[PDB]
Amino acid sequence: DEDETTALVCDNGSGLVKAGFAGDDAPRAVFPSIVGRPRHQGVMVGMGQKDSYVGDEAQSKRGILTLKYPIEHGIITNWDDMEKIWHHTFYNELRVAPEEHPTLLTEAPLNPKANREKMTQIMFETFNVPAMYVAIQAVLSLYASGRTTGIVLDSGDGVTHNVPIYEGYALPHAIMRLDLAGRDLTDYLMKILTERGYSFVTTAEREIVRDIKEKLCYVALDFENEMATAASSSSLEKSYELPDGQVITIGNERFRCPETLFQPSFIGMESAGIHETTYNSIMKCDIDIRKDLYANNVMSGGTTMYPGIADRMQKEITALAPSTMKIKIIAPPERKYSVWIGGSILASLSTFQQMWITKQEYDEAGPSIVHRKCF
Amino acid sequence: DEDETTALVCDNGSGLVKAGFAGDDAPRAVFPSIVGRPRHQGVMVGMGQKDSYVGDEAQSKRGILTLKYPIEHGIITNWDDMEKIWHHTFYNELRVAPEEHPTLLTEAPLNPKANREKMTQIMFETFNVPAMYVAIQAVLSLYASGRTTGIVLDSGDGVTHNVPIYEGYALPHAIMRLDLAGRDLTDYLMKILTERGYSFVTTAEREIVRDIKEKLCYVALDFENEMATAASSSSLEKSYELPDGQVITIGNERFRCPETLFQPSFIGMESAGIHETTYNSIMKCDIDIRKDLYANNVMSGGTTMYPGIADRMQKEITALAPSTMKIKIIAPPERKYSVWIGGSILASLSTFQQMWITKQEYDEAGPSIVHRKCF
Amino acid sequence: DEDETTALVCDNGSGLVKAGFAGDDAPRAVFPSIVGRPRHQGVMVGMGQKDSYVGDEAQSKRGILTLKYPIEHGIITNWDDMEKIWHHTFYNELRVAPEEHPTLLTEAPLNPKANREKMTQIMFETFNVPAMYVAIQAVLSLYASGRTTGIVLDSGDGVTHNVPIYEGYALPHAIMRLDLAGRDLTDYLMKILTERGYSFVTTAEREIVRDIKEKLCYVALDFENEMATAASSSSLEKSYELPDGQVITIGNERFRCPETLFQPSFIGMESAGIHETTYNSIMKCDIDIRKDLYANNVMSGGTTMYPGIADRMQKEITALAPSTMKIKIIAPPERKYSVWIGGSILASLSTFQQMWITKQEYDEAGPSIVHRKCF
Amino acid sequence: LSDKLKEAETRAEFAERSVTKLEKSIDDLEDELYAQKLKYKAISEELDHALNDMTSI
């Protein structure tokens, strides 16, 4: 289908995988990072049935499957499942076999080297990709947003990274990596919905809660005041339709879950929240850097699409920041989808063609080569 | 007399036996599961006279025979009598020797292990069957209906098993075995016909009442209103002709009988009825399963032929079910013959030839092997 | 009959009702949480006969009663039957009246809030208790066992809670509430005893099976080996005498039932077993916590009394756990009734006398007050 | 009786074929109903929420 050896681009998180091709401004398909497996003994004969289901197949057949995520806190722990995801992601929907096209995969700046090494090894030895690159997610977000400078908050399902970049340079001493993420927010919601009389303990139930969160939840500009009314009156409650026709009505839990981003103690996390994490990265940068980072809080990854988050993050930093200074958040509608787009931008830059590891250098050096070549 | 070594299908229950050749759409030999024996002293000599009569012989000469059923509440209690039923069914009516025809037998999912192994033993040691298989009636019902998913209500003479299957997999934790069946409905009718002045207790009488039930009884959609008029007027009475030319006229007993399906307390059973058990078979399955089982409530076996029952059940489950959700009953005219049809479909399936236990594996392991090989 | 206004303490679960007064070391009386009702029409005149029977009355007259348990896997729904259970517990056994004594009741940490609110409402409005306090079962389980640090494994009839507590603090993000309990084992045993030719489906039959389980069952340290011999020889069989003189001989079902605790898939549950939930609740805690929690896995509730259960879980946790570190299960003789004892300990602490909801605060605020006053 | 039966069977089968079609009409109708309700619900709710969150413009 393609008339050029454009790189293929994927952003593989602990949640979902966004995929498309280099040179576009959008992914063409999205898959959950899920491989599902039946937990029941077959009784009928001749009904097909796979050993495992991938992506959207895993969710469509989930009624009897246990659903596992191969990626946790930013890294691949199960790469056999990622190979099935990548075949499906690159060839079944995008219709391109990596054998004839370069591939770009992404990681956080401090993501364990073992993960970039496996991403490189898998695409070269299983998919025979002619070339590889593993990209920094923060770089990609800044390209997509039109910035060279800012604090990148990649606040998704796995890990919040929080890295300051200035004039294209990393400022690693100011990175505030935090093990606070969207997967934990979901777990908290499952526990508080349990308190309301709706226990969720199985995979189907877990996926429902993640659906409740995505459709009903928000952070709120002012949590304590929003909670004071939501916890006192039905006027701030919203219902959700459960798959079997039953419904659940949710009050302050609707925003208390997302609030864990600002109050991590809700899940037993030793943290002051994502806005102090952001603030400290600015604080630790040089004094003639700080002004540009205060003016550029960059939103990427999941949770950045909660109602009240763009306004809340600018307000929370303003509250920590010195007066006189202008604090600004970069949070357009195309917010968060900035990391996939950046992968496309980087892969297709003329100034980045020399950064591709070819399947020449790869076999001479082995997968450890990514640590020497990507950045 | 058959032109192919096709497995026989023999749905042998506590009521009747439907037997035929796999690959066809209907049984060829249908007999009651009856072995009859004379209960009188002979006076004439040179009268022939058998020690025992089977199937149609048992009913044709029943005027002086006591009639017994070798199968009770889903299991064989008298295997010697089943050998007599099987020999006749196979060699005289179907006109086939099992030696070249493997034969599929049927059972309920929670049916005692002893029954599945005894059936296996008789076919291998008395009939020298080359191979054996014992099938789940729910599997067969779903094949016949064109489904891999649904609740099979196999509401026959013995036991109502209420068993869910999803995507061809058993969901055994949700099977609601119920001690209410067509044999109890017959006994209830004998007791309330006694109230009307027509006591029925002897074999001829027991067979008559079963025939009355099959021909005259129904459930309709509203018991109390149907009773209000049936108990007040002859306009809802129906006459039944007894074998000697005498008649019995039956009023609300006509519906009070099968109503036991919705009111088990009528026979002293501690149960809320078949719609509660259908509901629990759906409800006890995972939330992403429930929607498909609600939409695929499958009628199978006997009693499914009471007028108003397919709609009565859809109404009664709908009444317990969440709103919005679509509750649907599958109730084709091939009702009750669907287990036989599925037996034909499964036995002849190319994908199921390896599922047959051969008479090699049988002797090495013994009859308990059916428990490990069939499902 | 008490000479002091000692708090009354009672654990009103889905299984048993344990009660006594604060300051003792045991409940004074224990009986089932049952309210029974006749399922038959009376024919003799002047026979007395109640509309409903409670506790031991419900079991004593059970031949014609249907028996219900007001508490559903840890939550009270049938508060009217529980009012009768409490009245019986207090007045016909302890010979106390809540009107003259403050009362302590208990629930699991992730138990729906409705339970605590309804228990509070009834004790204040129908029993006129001067004060109330809903305690945490995990708190009481560690008080009775003598720990401030450890995992509460409360594996009783209703629900298994699995909560880590460190230095008296909850570590709630690591709670693994699991829908696997002693109640499921009773129903599972009814189904596998059906496989052996002894079907059990009614209340009387369920009470018989609960008695079989309580007297014959164990888990064993090595399941597969115990299974291999129990399935091969009569040497591991044990008989049970039924109320009507029937005798059932039970083989590997004796442990296959209880084994569901380690293999939940036996009852269709999506779970790795109680040893993994214990393990993960510790693994989700900080490393300076884990060293103390692995050495203090603490049993409370029923099923913990099965032979091989403490050794079985310790073996599996140890196998999953890292070396050097010691893994241990605390399983004191004060099992199954230890949470009651913990209630006595809490109720009698001087540091607890400020924790009571008084019958002043209660009426001004209503029963929702328990949600703010107890914990 | 045979002609009456063939006519009664024609009516029973006619009606059974027709009821089958009607049952299909109901299944389709309910799916359409759900679409009306679901789309309505989705629209009324997406606006209540879009306007409740999108209040600052």
PDB file of N, CA and C in Angstrom, chain B residues 280-326:
ATOM      1  N   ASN B 280     -30.580 -17.323  37.213  1.00  0.00           N
ATOM      2  CA  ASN B 280     -29.328 -17.491  37.927  1.00  0.00           C
ATOM      3  C   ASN B 280     -28.245 -18.085  37.024  1.00  0.00           C
ATOM      4  N   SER B 281     -28.605 -18.934  36.067  1.00  0.00           N
ATOM      5  CA  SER B 281     -27.576 -19.449  35.180  1.00  0.00           C
ATOM      6  C   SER B 281     -26.973 -18.303  34.363  1.00  0.00           C
ATOM      7  N   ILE B 282     -27.788 -17.291  34.048  1.00  0.00           N
ATOM      8  CA  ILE B 282     -27.298 -16.133  33.315  1.00  0.00           C
ATOM      9  C   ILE B 282     -26.555 -15.199  34.273  1.00  0.00           C
ATOM     10  N   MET B 283     -27.189 -14.872  35.392  1.00  0.00           N
ATOM     11  CA  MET B 283     -26.688 -13.907  36.363  1.00  0.00           C
ATOM     12  C   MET B 283     -25.373 -14.302  37.018  1.00  0.00           C
ATOM     13  N   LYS B 284     -25.152 -15.598  37.220  1.00  0.00           N
ATOM     14  CA  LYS B 284     -23.955 -16.080  37.888  1.00  0.00           C
ATOM     15  C   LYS B 284     -22.750 -16.135  36.945  1.00  0.00           C
ATOM     16  N   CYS B 285     -22.946 -15.783  35.682  1.00  0.00           N
ATOM     17  CA  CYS B 285     -21.872 -15.729  34.712  1.00  0.00           C
ATOM     18  C   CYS B 285     -21.341 -14.295  34.732  1.00  0.00           C
ATOM     19  N   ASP B 286     -20.139 -14.068  34.220  1.00  0.00           N
ATOM     20  CA  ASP B 286     -19.568 -12.724  34.257  1.00  0.00           C
ATOM     21  C   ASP B 286     -20.422 -11.688  33.547  1.00  0.00           C
ATOM     22  N   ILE B 287     -20.284 -10.448  33.988  1.00  0.00           N
ATOM     23  CA  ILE B 287     -21.087  -9.355  33.466  1.00  0.00           C
ATOM     24  C   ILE B 287     -21.019  -9.159  31.943  1.00  0.00           C
ATOM     25  N   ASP B 288     -19.897  -9.514  31.304  1.00  0.00           N
ATOM     26  CA  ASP B 288     -19.774  -9.393  29.851  1.00  0.00           C
ATOM     27  C   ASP B 288     -20.216 -10.666  29.112  1.00  0.00           C
ATOM     28  N   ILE B 289     -20.708 -11.636  29.874  1.00  0.00           N
ATOM     29  CA  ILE B 289     -21.273 -12.885  29.383  1.00  0.00           C
ATOM     30  C   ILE B 289     -22.789 -12.773  29.412  1.00  0.00           C
ATOM     31  N   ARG B 290     -23.293 -12.236  30.517  1.00  0.00           N
ATOM     32  CA  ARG B 290     -24.722 -12.077  30.760  1.00  0.00           C
ATOM     33  C   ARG B 290     -25.536 -11.553  29.584  1.00  0.00           C
ATOM     34  N   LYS B 291     -25.003 -10.579  28.856  1.00  0.00           N
ATOM     35  CA  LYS B 291     -25.765 -10.018  27.748  1.00  0.00           C
ATOM     36  C   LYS B 291     -26.035 -11.032  26.631  1.00  0.00           C
ATOM     37  N   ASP B 292     -25.115 -11.977  26.438  1.00  0.00           N
ATOM     38  CA  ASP B 292     -25.234 -12.914  25.351  1.00  0.00           C
ATOM     39  C   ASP B 292     -26.079 -14.070  25.792  1.00  0.00           C
ATOM     40  N   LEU B 293     -26.038 -14.375  27.079  1.00  0.00           N
ATOM     41  CA  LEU B 293     -26.869 -15.459  27.552  1.00  0.00           C
ATOM     42  C   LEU B 293     -28.330 -14.963  27.645  1.00  0.00           C
ATOM     43  N   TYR B 294     -28.561 -13.684  27.992  1.00  0.00           N
ATOM     44  CA  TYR B 294     -29.940 -13.171  28.046  1.00  0.00           C
ATOM     45  C   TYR B 294     -30.590 -13.259  26.680  1.00  0.00           C
ATOM     46  N   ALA B 295     -29.809 -12.963  25.641  1.00  0.00           N
ATOM     47  CA  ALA B 295     -30.266 -12.967  24.260  1.00  0.00           C
ATOM     48  C   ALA B 295     -30.345 -14.368  23.640  1.00  0.00           C
ATOM     49  N   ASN B 296     -29.885 -15.391  24.365  1.00  0.00           N
ATOM     50  CA  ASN B 296     -29.856 -16.756  23.879  1.00  0.00           C
ATOM     51  C   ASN B 296     -30.286 -17.745  24.955  1.00  0.00           C
ATOM     52  N   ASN B 297     -31.531 -17.625  25.370  1.00  0.00           N
ATOM     53  CA  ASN B 297     -32.162 -18.524  26.318  1.00  0.00           C
ATOM     54  C   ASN B 297     -32.737 -19.664  25.458  1.00  0.00           C
ATOM     55  N   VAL B 298     -32.181 -20.871  25.574  1.00  0.00           N
ATOM     56  CA  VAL B 298     -32.521 -21.963  24.661  1.00  0.00           C
ATOM     57  C   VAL B 298     -33.416 -23.058  25.234  1.00  0.00           C
ATOM     58  N   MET B 299     -34.554 -23.286  24.575  1.00  0.00           N
ATOM     59  CA  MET B 299     -35.465 -24.325  25.032  1.00  0.00           C
ATOM     60  C   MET B 299     -34.990 -25.631  24.407  1.00  0.00           C
ATOM     61  N   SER B 300     -34.940 -26.697  25.189  1.00  0.00           N
ATOM     62  CA  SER B 300     -34.533 -28.003  24.694  1.00  0.00           C
ATOM     63  C   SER B 300     -35.221 -29.134  25.440  1.00  0.00           C
ATOM     64  N   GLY B 301     -35.372 -30.273  24.795  1.00  0.00           N
ATOM     65  CA  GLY B 301     -35.977 -31.403  25.486  1.00  0.00           C
ATOM     66  C   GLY B 301     -37.493 -31.262  25.653  1.00  0.00           C
ATOM     67  N   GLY B 302     -38.033 -32.067  26.561  1.00  0.00           N
ATOM     68  CA  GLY B 302     -39.470 -32.130  26.794  1.00  0.00           C
ATOM     69  C   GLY B 302     -40.001 -30.972  27.615  1.00  0.00           C
ATOM     70  N   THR B 303     -41.331 -30.903  27.780  1.00  0.00           N
ATOM     71  CA  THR B 303     -42.046 -29.813  28.494  1.00  0.00           C
ATOM     72  C   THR B 303     -41.962 -28.449  27.768  1.00  0.00           C
ATOM     73  N   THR B 304     -41.083 -28.342  26.774  1.00  0.00           N
ATOM     74  CA  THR B 304     -40.877 -27.138  25.984  1.00  0.00           C
ATOM     75  C   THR B 304     -42.020 -26.990  24.998  1.00  0.00           C
ATOM     76  N   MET B 305     -42.833 -28.041  24.945  1.00  0.00           N
ATOM     77  CA  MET B 305     -44.001 -28.149  24.115  1.00  0.00           C
ATOM     78  C   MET B 305     -45.309 -27.837  24.868  1.00  0.00           C
ATOM     79  N   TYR B 306     -45.234 -27.245  26.087  1.00  0.00           N
ATOM     80  CA  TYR B 306     -46.459 -26.760  26.748  1.00  0.00           C
ATOM     81  C   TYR B 306     -46.838 -25.435  26.080  1.00  0.00           C
ATOM     82  N   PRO B 307     -48.064 -25.224  25.597  1.00  0.00           N
ATOM     83  CA  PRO B 307     -48.445 -23.970  24.991  1.00  0.00           C
ATOM     84  C   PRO B 307     -48.199 -22.804  25.939  1.00  0.00           C
ATOM     85  N   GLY B 308     -47.598 -21.756  25.380  1.00  0.00           N
ATOM     86  CA  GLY B 308     -47.271 -20.537  26.101  1.00  0.00           C
ATOM     87  C   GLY B 308     -45.922 -20.579  26.820  1.00  0.00           C
ATOM     88  N   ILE B 309     -45.218 -21.716  26.814  1.00  0.00           N
ATOM     89  CA  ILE B 309     -43.975 -21.791  27.586  1.00  0.00           C
ATOM     90  C   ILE B 309     -42.806 -20.973  27.059  1.00  0.00           C
ATOM     91  N   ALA B 310     -42.610 -20.869  25.745  1.00  0.00           N
ATOM     92  CA  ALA B 310     -41.465 -20.086  25.291  1.00  0.00           C
ATOM     93  C   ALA B 310     -41.645 -18.612  25.653  1.00  0.00           C
ATOM     94  N   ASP B 311     -42.877 -18.119  25.561  1.00  0.00           N
ATOM     95  CA  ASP B 311     -43.136 -16.723  25.855  1.00  0.00           C
ATOM     96  C   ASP B 311     -43.289 -16.500  27.345  1.00  0.00           C
ATOM     97  N   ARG B 312     -43.803 -17.508  28.044  1.00  0.00           N
ATOM     98  CA  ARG B 312     -43.965 -17.438  29.486  1.00  0.00           C
ATOM     99  C   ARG B 312     -42.588 -17.270  30.109  1.00  0.00           C
ATOM    100  N   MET B 313     -41.621 -18.046  29.624  1.00  0.00           N
ATOM    101  CA  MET B 313     -40.275 -17.948  30.128  1.00  0.00           C
ATOM    102  C   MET B 313     -39.640 -16.616  29.772  1.00  0.00           C
ATOM    103  N   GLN B 314     -39.831 -16.121  28.549  1.00  0.00           N
ATOM    104  CA  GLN B 314     -39.174 -14.870  28.218  1.00  0.00           C
ATOM    105  C   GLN B 314     -39.697 -13.779  29.140  1.00  0.00           C
ATOM    106  N   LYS B 315     -41.008 -13.806  29.421  1.00  0.00           N
ATOM    107  CA  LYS B 315     -41.650 -12.856  30.319  1.00  0.00           C
ATOM    108  C   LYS B 315     -41.124 -12.963  31.753  1.00  0.00           C
ATOM    109  N   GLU B 316     -41.023 -14.196  32.268  1.00  0.00           N
ATOM    110  CA  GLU B 316     -40.571 -14.444  33.632  1.00  0.00           C
ATOM    111  C   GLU B 316     -39.100 -14.105  33.841  1.00  0.00           C
ATOM    112  N   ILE B 317     -38.255 -14.291  32.821  1.00  0.00           N
ATOM    113  CA  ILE B 317     -36.851 -13.927  32.976  1.00  0.00           C
ATOM    114  C   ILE B 317     -36.776 -12.406  32.868  1.00  0.00           C
ATOM    115  N   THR B 318     -37.501 -11.808  31.914  1.00  0.00           N
ATOM    116  CA  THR B 318     -37.514 -10.356  31.726  1.00  0.00           C
ATOM    117  C   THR B 318     -37.879  -9.658  33.029  1.00  0.00           C
ATOM    118  N   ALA B 319     -38.828 -10.228  33.764  1.00  0.00           N
ATOM    119  CA  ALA B 319     -39.295  -9.716  35.048  1.00  0.00           C
ATOM    120  C   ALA B 319     -38.201  -9.701  36.141  1.00  0.00           C
ATOM    121  N   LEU B 320     -37.175 -10.550  36.007  1.00  0.00           N
ATOM    122  CA  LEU B 320     -36.080 -10.665  36.968  1.00  0.00           C
ATOM    123  C   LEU B 320     -34.847  -9.889  36.473  1.00  0.00           C
ATOM    124  N   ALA B 321     -34.724  -9.824  35.153  1.00  0.00           N
ATOM    125  CA  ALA B 321     -33.635  -9.202  34.422  1.00  0.00           C
ATOM    126  C   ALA B 321     -33.641  -7.675  34.561  1.00  0.00           C
ATOM    127  N   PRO B 322     -32.486  -7.010  34.398  1.00  0.00           N
ATOM    128  CA  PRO B 322     -32.354  -5.571  34.305  1.00  0.00           C
ATOM    129  C   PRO B 322     -33.127  -5.056  33.096  1.00  0.00           C
ATOM    130  N   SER B 323     -33.572  -3.810  33.170  1.00  0.00           N
ATOM    131  CA  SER B 323     -34.276  -3.151  32.081  1.00  0.00           C
ATOM    132  C   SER B 323     -33.277  -2.832  30.982  1.00  0.00           C
ATOM    133  N   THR B 324     -33.761  -2.393  29.809  1.00  0.00           N
ATOM    134  CA  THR B 324     -32.945  -2.087  28.607  1.00  0.00           C
ATOM    135  C   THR B 324     -32.494  -3.369  27.890  1.00  0.00           C
ATOM    136  N   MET B 325     -31.957  -4.303  28.653  1.00  0.00           N
ATOM    137  CA  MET B 325     -31.478  -5.584  28.179  1.00  0.00           C
ATOM    138  C   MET B 325     -32.543  -6.366  27.445  1.00  0.00           C
ATOM    139  N   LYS B 326     -32.135  -6.991  26.343  1.00  0.00           N
ATOM    140  CA  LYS B 326     -33.023  -7.834  25.578  1.00  0.00           C
ATOM    141  C   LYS B 326     -32.898  -9.283  25.991  1.00  0.00           C
TER     142      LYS B 326
END
